[PDB]
Paper text:
Anion exchanger 1 (AE1, band 3) is a major membrane protein of red blood cells and plays a key role in acid-base homeostasis, urine acidification, red blood cell shape regulation, and removal of carbon dioxide during respiration. AE1, a member of the solute carrier ion transport family 4 (SLC4), mediates the exchange of HCO3− with Cl− across plasma membranes. Mammalian erythrocyte AE1 is a ~100 kD integral transmembrane glycoprotein consisting of an N-terminal cytoplasmic domain (CD, residues 1 to 360 in human AE1) and a C-terminal trans-membrane domain (TMD, residues 361 to 911 in human AE1). Here we present the [name] structures of full-length bovine AE1 with its TMD captured in both IF and OF conformations.
Author numbering:
A (entry chain A), B (entry chain B): 420 to 707, 720 to 747, 775 to 909
Write the structure that this text describes.
Amino acid sequence: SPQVLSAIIFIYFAALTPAITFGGLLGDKTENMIGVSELLLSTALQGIIFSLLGAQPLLVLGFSGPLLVFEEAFYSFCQTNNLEYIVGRVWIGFWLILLVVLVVAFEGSFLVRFISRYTQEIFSFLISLIFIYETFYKLVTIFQDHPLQKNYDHDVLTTPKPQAALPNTALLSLVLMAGTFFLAMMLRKFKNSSYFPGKLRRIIGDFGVPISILIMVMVDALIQDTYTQKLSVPEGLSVSNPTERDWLIHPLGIRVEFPIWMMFASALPALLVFILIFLESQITTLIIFHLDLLLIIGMGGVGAIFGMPWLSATTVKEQRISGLLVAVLVGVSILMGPVLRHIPLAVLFGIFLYMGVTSLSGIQLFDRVLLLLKPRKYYPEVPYARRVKTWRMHLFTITQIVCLVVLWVVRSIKQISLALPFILILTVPLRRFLLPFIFRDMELKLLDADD
Amino acid sequence: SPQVLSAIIFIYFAALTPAITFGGLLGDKTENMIGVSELLLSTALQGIIFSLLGAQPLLVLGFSGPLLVFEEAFYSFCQTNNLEYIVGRVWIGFWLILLVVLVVAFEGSFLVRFISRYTQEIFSFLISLIFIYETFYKLVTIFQDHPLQKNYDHDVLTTPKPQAALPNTALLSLVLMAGTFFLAMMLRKFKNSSYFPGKLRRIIGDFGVPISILIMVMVDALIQDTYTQKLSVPEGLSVSNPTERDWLIHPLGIRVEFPIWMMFASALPALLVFILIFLESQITTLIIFHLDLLLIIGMGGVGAIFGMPWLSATTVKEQRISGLLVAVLVGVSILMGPVLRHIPLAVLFGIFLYMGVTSLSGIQLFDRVLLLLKPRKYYPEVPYARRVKTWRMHLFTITQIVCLVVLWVVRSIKQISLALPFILILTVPLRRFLLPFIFRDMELKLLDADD
């Protein structure tokens, strides 16, 4: 049917846009171990093996920011002490497996009843802040790798990586990253404009991210005499750096024996995986049970066997075939390596920043963070700003900002890390115990009352 | 008084912002003959010698876009046949002088009664289109002067001008031009926002252009190892390229005798100067007369004696001292050459584009040019869109677009030029004779009825 023909490409683009950029981000946050080929394959089988078994086969299992934060933190920790990033993570997966049985025997979704706005708008807000900060850290690395000079050197080999500073890169990349973001923002506003009649508009506006990558892929295509960093994509059905990893992974290590005292001490880096996948797994279920989430947990654990990052829930009869088709198309997408390698990394990072910005404006916390600076004579009329004293509003925002700073500090120091979720989850008692001691109940039902 | 102390700096910045950028534009549109030192001095004496004698001493005599268009057209024509740009223009000034007497004897401001919206919104709209097109022509010249490569050469001398292509310029300039414009737009929106209380906001917002040049002057200051094109400013009270021109100009030429058959055939390039200065001289007088304009005409003619471009009217008791002070400060401003030469040209061109954009949104013609593309179900409610048939509105815009294209073609071809004003003024009969034959009087009083 014509409806399906359009819907399947719509969902295909919506699901393919984040995967490639996250694969590139992982390719840079690690040496080259985890990239696009395995990640794009990670969600390929996952689609079908969730569509076959699932309460809601209309959902999409994409890759989310918090998971990436956890893996980059793990890589940072994995380098403080000599450890194999791939191999150790594998054991984490096995630990997840034994957590599956303990919840299959008896449900453990009680915490869903204790999750509120104070928690999911301080956590998501932090994610929208790590995305913006992440792209500004790359400019520093670029300016140090290719510093601005006027002499340079002749004929530097660059096939594996630029061996020395060369011109037209430190600030060409800046143009490329700042161009995609600008075009994406303009098309986002286009979708919410009055140019062109109705549907004939939103057909293109709804494809802003998929469309605002090709313009400046062509830009790099038309500029070939200047080198730019691009994606690291191996051949079809192949693992990037096949001399460093294989499809089948040996738990005892590939090159160096994995330390003995790590086999059974990997429980801690696994319950946190479970917590992160759990918290995000209910935000996307409020659009409208236990087995649906337990399958996701076990299947993410399975993904740790051959070396694929685990997936997480995302946004949204013939229900089965939709997931079937999206999964098979994603799987076949990895055969376009020769044309997929022309995409430069700065374009992906610009799309990443665009993701980090749009997700920020939808959070209701920011709408009052700005009001803090706003003078108290232009406040918008919302039924939580006229029934509450003005000098009490700013106090709540300060209570949230202090927690935000506390969370940020932990994410900054390299030594003490991998505990951001542990320090974040204990904010729920702060909301359930400390907050009811300072604010009145009839006032608190308007600041952090989730709908 | 404190009021004066703030007002004088306010007007000083408002009058100094356009002069520097126009001087740079002239420095590039000519070899180096006319630049900033003489132009910034051109309006220095002019301020006092108009404040002393003038009907409204509160006005400001700045440099406008159409005049610059005329001078660049004259330079283009001056190169088709071997002629001295400075010397020939001098004679034009003398011609303007004899036009002064003919109008002093009897007034000639009749055409003011025949100027309407159809004329000053098709002319100003074009000006806002050259400004945008002008800055996009420079990128082509830059990419041809410094093409993108990866080998380049070592140690190129650049003191008078870059003798060969060097890195970090073809697209650094792009960052610099696109940065000032973005910041200026953001601060323009800042002035129309609700951040910060009332006046404490608009004090900075009203200085958007003066403030959004220093940030990225500092950017170039912090990047000194990469060369960028900058202003050509000579020492204090000196003419740029003093081996090519002097303060006192000899009408028979400096290096080559000026052709004889040009002395008395320069009337045509002078009546057009008069027409351009006339048409703009009434748009700024409708905010609420002959000698006031005749003085401007004669004084612009005087400016052609020592080699300064003529000035034109612009936007807006102690009235005298304001002009006195603004003039003396402008005159003294030319002593800051050592610090004024650090400003790069791309910054000035970005400010030029900003000027070309803001002036575009204020024209009521554009507000319906966009409606042409708008579907006929979101039209704004203005008392000229509900009393007129929709299919008749687009016709008027087409009648204006065809004239716009006709005007653009003339400005494009190099051979046939210097006649844009001649072909534009005869649009007034088109408005007074052709238009009343196709549209009804009771319908025409809502499309081009000036207030």
